[PDB]
Write a protein that binds this ligand. Structure first.
Ligand code: XYU
Lengths: 95, 107
């Protein structure tokens, strides 16, 4: 059970990142889980399964990152709440 | 703890078993009445699985005793919500919360 496919990686990543932020108030830790996963997407899809994942969920995940980056400048936690609304939508669809 | 007061009745029969996802509409507000979150305002219900510690204790115990179609006022103690830490930038420390929640269906 090593998470190799993108939906597997995002599912375990979003679970862990939410546990850090909502469970433990650890914004830094949340970002340390998420930033690498977004960077993986930004490298681009390499396989067919990555391509179809990207077509389904790429826009939503990209927008969640923009809300997080809004938070980085604003400091307004409501912007992280927006991001988590988008991340939860992805999480349910890949569960 | 949590106090459940029925606003609108459900069927009084279909209660959520563990394993099922509860689909709800909610409106969360502080003790004074100021809203902090509402699924109704977004026009998109909230889905979550019960008894997995997914949500705050007031929901875990409160929503468990609701029937399908029921709408209720959940007054939740701070130790049954976010406690001393709170939820930074939304819910402060030692906050009594009030949720107007409607159990729409189970999936
Ligand atoms: C975009 O919106 C936010 C919710 C905002 C966030 C800010 C809030 C003030 C408030 O505005 O909702 C609010 O109204 C509220 O108070 N709610 C929401 C309605 C249910 C009752 C109550 C309320 O308990 O919510 C909860 C506590 C925040 C955290 C939890 C309290 C119990 C404690 O054990 C948890 O430790 C891990 C932390 C948030 C829940 O909703 C979501 C669905 C659950 C979690 C984040 C965790 O379980 C998580 O674990 C690892 C999961 O498994 C999920 C399924 C993983 C997934 C990848 C992330 C989902 C994130 C969704 C975020 C949403 C929907």
């Amino acid at each position: 059970g090593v998470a190799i496919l993108w939906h597997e990686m995002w599912h375990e990543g979003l679970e862990e990142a939410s546990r850090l932020y909502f469970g433990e108030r650890n914004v830094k830790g949340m970002f340390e889980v998420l930033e690498p996963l977004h960077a993986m997407m930004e490298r681009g899809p390499q396989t067919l399964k990555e391509t179809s994942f990207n077509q389904a969920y790429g826009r939503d995940l990209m927008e969640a990152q923009e809300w997080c980056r809004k938070y980085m400048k604003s400091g307004n936690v409501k912007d992280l709440t927006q991001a988590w609304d988008l991340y939860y939508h992805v999480f349910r669809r890949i569960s | 703890g949590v106090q459940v007061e029925t606003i609108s009745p459900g069927d009084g029969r279909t209660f959520p078993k563990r394993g099922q996802t509860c689909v709800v509409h909610y409106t969360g507000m502080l003790e004074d009445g100021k809203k902090f979150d509402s699924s109704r305002d977004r026009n998109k219900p909230f889905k979550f699985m019960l008894g997995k510690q997914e949500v705050i204790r007031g929901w875990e115990e409160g929503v468990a005793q609701m029937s399908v179609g029921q709408r209720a006022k959940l007054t939740i103690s701070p130790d049954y919500a976010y406690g001393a830490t709170g939820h930074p930038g939304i819910i402060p420390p030692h906050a009594t919360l009030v949720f107007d929640v409607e159990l729409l269906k189970l999936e």
